[model samples]
Target chain A: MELRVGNRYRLGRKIGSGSFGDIYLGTDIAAGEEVAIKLECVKTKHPQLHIESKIYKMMQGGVGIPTIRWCGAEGDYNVMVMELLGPSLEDLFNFCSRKFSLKTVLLLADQMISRIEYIHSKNFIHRDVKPDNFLMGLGKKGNLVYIIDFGLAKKYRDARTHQHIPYRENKNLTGTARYASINTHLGIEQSRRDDLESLGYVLMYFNLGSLPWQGLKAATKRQKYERISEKKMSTPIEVLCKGYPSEFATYLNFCRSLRFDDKPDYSYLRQLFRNLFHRQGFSYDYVFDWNML
Target chain B: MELRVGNRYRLGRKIGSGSFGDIYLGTDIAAGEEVAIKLECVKTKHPQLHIESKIYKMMQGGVGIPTIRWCGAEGDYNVMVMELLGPSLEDLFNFCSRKFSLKTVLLLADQMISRIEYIHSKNFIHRDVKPDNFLMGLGKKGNLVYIIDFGLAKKYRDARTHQHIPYRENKNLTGTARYASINTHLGIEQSRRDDLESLGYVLMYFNLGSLPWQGLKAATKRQKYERISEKKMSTPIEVLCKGYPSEFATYLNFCRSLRFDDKPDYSYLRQLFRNLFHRQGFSYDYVFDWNMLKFG
Candidate 1:
């Protein structure tokens, strides 16, 4: 009972950040499948995992979502079991010497946009959209990509009425500074476009090897975001998309142009990259630069 | 660690005899079914429950056998979760004024023979067969007879070779004295024939209200068992099967004469009862004498 979640799964080697002894690789005793188990201590300043599990089930059937096999509390932690996936985009990016190919970024760009589209359709916005949150599938599903980590995910719309969540201002930072949308850095409530905006940074980061704000320094953590946010707001779209295709600038502009409560033209955004992909004559083969090794 | 078994089955109210905390009524959480759990202490003079669980799984295809839902050691006990069954034959017999109808006895004998046939066919023999080990199923299966409790069960033959084990003598008793086979009494290895012979005593006990060995004066374990053995062998088969059709006598005769290494003709015994059941104008309805309640 101490380390076992729901009794059918056994915890194995630990993984993840914070050295908190919460996350682990586990084995599904009944299913015979290896899985990853995430634990949020039941006693804490916050417990976001239990609801995360419910949303995982509610948003099931989406191709890029992680399957929550089982979730229940054991001893000190609220635990969740999920399908094990391959390397994270962060891992893949680091593995390929901190830079990814244009084709790889284009392929990832289409899927990432589609993943956020499905997520927003399911009434939630992935507030913390980053390379670390996206992972590739293993074995025969190697080409398939999956989105995970819902700790900071927010339900941005009403379920039955389908009305958008009302806009608000003066919110705390909700994501990593390296890829946080400009509005998110300004403490604005995240919406679907905020997710897309963060994703635009992710796409650009993948192709450009690094972002302008990544190397900024500050005396404290509070000023760190201030510096990145200033650099992000001052950098012109022309300067940002100087080395990349014009569609990259067009993607960021579309994301930034949306009203807080308005619905996104998801097809229009996805087609921007698809058109870029076709014009560049790159097939949608899903083979990433890191997959060869 | 407390009462849970396999993490999926939750043990509920404690059931069965014995002050020891072993058996319990449980629930299968995954299937949402009521189940019975039997436990044997891992630290024991001997632990027989583990093998019993394995045998239950081996005999799963038989209709009258208990389905072992799950089994694994938890804490100090090796535990088993099985399908919950209805009342035992002993309780049913007591409920029916301590006597059974000829129709009820015949129906039970026929079904009882098949339980052994299935068990023996799986390369194991239930050394402990008595009214307590035989139970009825619930509701629609209320008439179905099921054999339970295989703590004393033994694998009687080779799995691959299928050869009979050599007979041995000076064996300790493996069943209740009143219903144990005569060979079991005289220190001979018990076999399939022994199971049928025990069934004959059980059928007789149900109708006759008691066996000849139930109340012999004996103070010691040795004397108590020895007198029952003596009375059993001394009694004539004609007298034992008295007031019933000759089919009962023929069944007992066949069981007693079977070689220690030979398989008993299970089909022949079932046919005897089926023929007697037909002649007596009995239908296959599962209603029993106990169901009548016959309060007197």
Candidate 2:
């Protein structure tokens, strides 16, 4: 809807659509800046863009966080104007024929984990950890990937007391089944451990083309998710990370070994691939597998 | 008709359009770069994009010039991919309610003339010197202005022979009627002199909010063009520059005095605005009047 929104922003064509809102290319009429405008209907039972806008400001002022211009509700919808990014990793993965080289996965893992570390270090955990949430910056910083979409993200612990949220079973899954942690599928309260484990599967998915638990025949969506959970439980870490580098198995094992309150050794996991990238005679020049162009 | 085109560049939404071609946002799928695609229909009587793409390469390699990624013929049209820029100066002029501070006008004129000197030195003159042709850079270079749209641009002096084109009159005009030089309105062949003269009108347009000849109503386009020229020709520089600073009139006076084929005193013209910026106790910062965010 080409409308002059929030008094100054002129919302242009819809560029992306999300679960709760739609993203449009917006031009700040005053500043002449091109930005992304996410609009959610005011009538939606639960509006997430208003909450997402706050989280964007809360977790901002660091790397990988897009700058938000304005947030408000007008007429029938609430909106958020933010810096427009290029495309997400999932889109680029599809662009490169759905598979990446081992070197690309390792380098992508380093930054992916860097984003996880930054998010976790800031007292928050992105429950919905997936390649779709990871996006590349545009133009001058095109090579750098920015971790985005904090809709399902939450403060893992209380910010005031610095206490980890109590871990419990019998909770709902909050992320994509393709890369969700085993504990997440089992309905366990997600903590920092689940984030790292979820990222491991994302890395594995990049190199492995698709996960083994995919394509399960189920009568219902609930049954399908449970079947996926059962398959992940049966697969061993060594068998899952088979044929790939042993570090993949080691990273998975280390993340799964963390206690509910324990902070996983982020530097160790990042350097694990950091050295793997080095020993393979590769420079961290950001030339990905798809950058053969 | 949009085809699945651009070869390596995945075509995207339409942003701006022109008589010669339409512009769309494009993406380089492999390198993951966001670019602007200028697509000219191959079926146009005289295709311009293929030629514009060539001139884009020849006029590049200097500051304020956009980076060209690729130029190719896609199914029905020829495409040129270049770095994306922010809105044009005309957009920002309206953003600030059609008014510009002396500081903003001087800072803008610096780069505007700098673009002229750079293009003129290359023996190419940007015939279209208006607010729409001057655009701000994106992201890191957001404050700097870039000169774009070289469709009407031509080489004033031959690169191989280094010889200037002979002066002529009773020729078709090559630029926008609003910012066209007096020489252009009189049908004189455009040269470096005309580029500087068109820039003076543009700077004056920025300060005066809008030109006096704007919103001219006529039965036809030709009649409108004639009345605009008559108004411009009859209006004295003293009367037009009455409200703005004396330097603005001086800029116009200096521009109009240049003989056809004569090299413009570019350094002096640029310094005229540059020193005004210095003397007014205004730092050469890029904080324009429109930088103030308008929010509800």
Candidate 3:
């Protein structure tokens, strides 16, 4: 059943649903534009909601995620005003499968990496970069990539001080198991390089169309995570990055550089992207012509 | 220059040509069926051709390759008669990159692996299992996978002893590089596992449509091989095998089991296939379904 949301935004059809709550594409009567009204479920009332609200407030004007238009309580609902976006990377992946070209993949990687570098600059880690979380904004030039679902997001400092650790003091292993870095699998504090590793996995998925490890298909979540610690199973990132350019080689080396005390400044990642885009010969306006008959 | 030859088999237009030689679709006057006649240019009369001719002769009764109706020498042209086939695996791969299903991939792997095991049992190694060498036999049910291009093939003992290592070693390297095993890349003698490793690469290629190491995109072959040795590369086989059943895992493990004296035995591979087909709740008839997709 669909709930009639606020009078300001006419909640039309339920457009998206996931673990968090339901989102509806609504007509913003006051703004005279279409907007997405995200209704927080009762589960959002947990302490985690406060953390999310804080991150959302902090991320204002950031050029990565959808701009939070407005945030307020409509009765018991936590309504967040956000820009409507087109299909997520998961949707595009299901459409193209393994036939996606390297140019589009590199473009997506560069844009998302740029966004990730921005998030790291704001002293926050996305902590999740799976296909579902990477989205393309709606309409013309819909090539613009955005990161979403900051429910697992946390300030780097809070995570370092143990203030934001999940229940049982476990570092929030909030990402999907298949895309999670080796460090995240070990319950270590999230870092910029961990996000990069997840991005690397995304690039691989664009090309390979499948995960690298086998045990994730196991029935239980425990069965999945247990395989990580026991098997030292190589992640898709490891496999795909084997012969990638040195820019990525440097990035993976950075991910393996788990010493948080010496974590390269966000500037280091920015420079890596600069080198990757410029020096590595990847173009912004890349296109592959498979028309040769 | 084109040469017209082969008694009772008229070599028509050159349908395809490769590093080995040209392949022609011909009409068999005796059986009145279409056949592929692969021709090799032998500049110097090497005694190995005699062994190859004998091998083809012995392979007549086998279900592995197309039946060698006859082999003869007309001037410089050495022609061999065999059953005609449709699109090669490489052709199919190029034609339908994204259309294969998970079931199709597994069935293809089973048939190719089983066929490789069969060849090993006969004490021979196809040595090349790339897409170009896998052919779709003509009018066969479900794109029946037939092993083709025996030009580089050698007896297992011959390859191991380095007796059949072709001169122009770099040319040999060029021929095998696409599916060359990591050990072969290290300049080691070919082993049964070498073929399996190559076959594993092929299985991955069909599903992923990209080489694991991204092909020769690397700066140097050394860098590529080093990455492979360190388990740094991602190939199609690695991805597809991840979600496979325990039988699939066991099959990979057996295929991957490499030792100095290791030789793959047919019974072991067959057992693995039987278990995988059963465990996956798939019928053996799916084998025909698989070949149809692969060859078609």
Candidate 4:
């Protein structure tokens, strides 16, 4: 069947596909504009589309979040129209040979930190924080980084009372296994601190090109994740950040130091990267490695 | 004094500068985003920035056009914060050694035509259509073509009446002298036909790597334009499209045949390129010749 949604957007070729559904390049016929339509099977018990739409509504007008254009049921699927963004950071990371320069990592860290900070301020934790979830904007917004995929995102605070949700145990592990925080593996409830820890692993992965826990020999998926989580916690921060800036280790330590109810000093985290930039004698130029090329 | 604006955007290196003002790569501190800020001096008589902001507001949400994030006055300048687009087509043309394969040109022509059609539908004409003005999206949407720089854009139809504006004579040309339409050279007012005609020249220039009227010599800009215009008018379509697909000639002829007020057949023009794609047995893959390169 031809893919048309809201009787207005004409869906085109598939740009992406994942556990949730397939993402297609679509055109808003009435507006004559291009968009990305995410389709999920309505038969599925998990209504990720509805959840994501709600999260996006809560995050409306925030930087680095794709604006939700429309969401509705279409034939056998629940469809959502979003502002089509550029390639994922993982795509670019592999495009640049799986390695990012310190400068590139610094630039990306600044943007991603701000995005995470904003999400936390909105009382939601993006449980899945990884390179694949962060995308660059297309065209003029190309340099701008956007955070996507809210299927695993959860509200961490009470909006009515502005109170932190009490920590609980034995919660199912969420987020990509490779970048999941150590607490996630322990069945502990995830929070803003868990999100920041996952980001720390991501930044280290970007700088070092690979993580120490990668490629562990385990027969079962659960065993593999357990082993990977064990390695992540057992490995010293110095060993993880070797040959890279010591500030990376400091950043991770900062995340590890946070309690469930603690509000992170977002400014201090940003200042760490700014200090690193200063130490390297690099000015605040937005030009990344790709731009230099 | 620094080149900051709104007490938020810290201006950095200048990426481009033109008659209107300087374009800088700036940082929006609050949002932690990079933006291209075009600054026009308030003292200057030309209110191009204001006019361009209005046009961009009307063109918001249109693919291939930059979204104007913010527009206001900052001290001595009128500032506009726009999406920071990628390099211009001219830059890519040079990067590719001034030539594009047939497949690449076909892909570009389709997107460019759609952009022009959208602008025309909005009752405005982008007088300055050149390689420098058409840019690709920086990262993932790099395959997409965007029409930018609306300093010379003008509304060609009335809002209330929806009637086409009458063409006038002896009007100063408003586009790049080399890619200007024949009507522009004849001192006639530009309309949608002129935009399409200019686009025709741009496509041919991409294919042939040079236009027939290129390198004409004259003492003054006016004389050079006149000479180039005469050469452009005199050149046969067959000669202009020599060694290429005959569809190129057909496309140009279609553009040349349009009257001053006639609405362009956008679908028909797009079909010309579609036909070329089909004849070549190429699928609708976004991968271009540059994508095949390692650096690309």
Give model 3's DockQ, 2 decimals.
0.01
Better of 1 and 2 by TM-score: 2
Model 4 C-alpha lDDT versus the unseen true structure: 0.83
lDDT minimum window of 10 residues, candidate 2 chain B: B166-175
**TM-score per candidate:** 0.49, 0.49, 0.43, 0.51
Please give the ranking of all candidate structures by TM-score, highest first, separated by commas.
4, 2, 1, 3
lDDT of 2: 0.81
Output the number of the TM-score-best candidate.
Answer: 4
> Which residue window of length 10 is worst by lDDT in model 1 chain A?
A14-23
Candidate 1 residue spans exceeding 4 A from truth: A1-3, A18-21, B1-296
Q: How accurate locally, in lDDT, is each candidate?
A: 0.79, 0.81, 0.62, 0.83
- CAPRI category for model 1: incorrect
Over 4 Å off, model 3: A1-3, A30-32, A42-50, A158-172, A214-216, A228-249, A265-283, A286-293, B1-296
lDDT of 4 by residue, B55-88 (tens): 8899999988898879999888889999998888
The residue pairs in collision within model 2 are none
Task: Report the first chain's TM-score for all candidates.
Answer: 0.94, 0.94, 0.78, 0.95
Q: What is the TM-score of chain A in candidate 4?
A: 0.95
Best by lDDT: 4
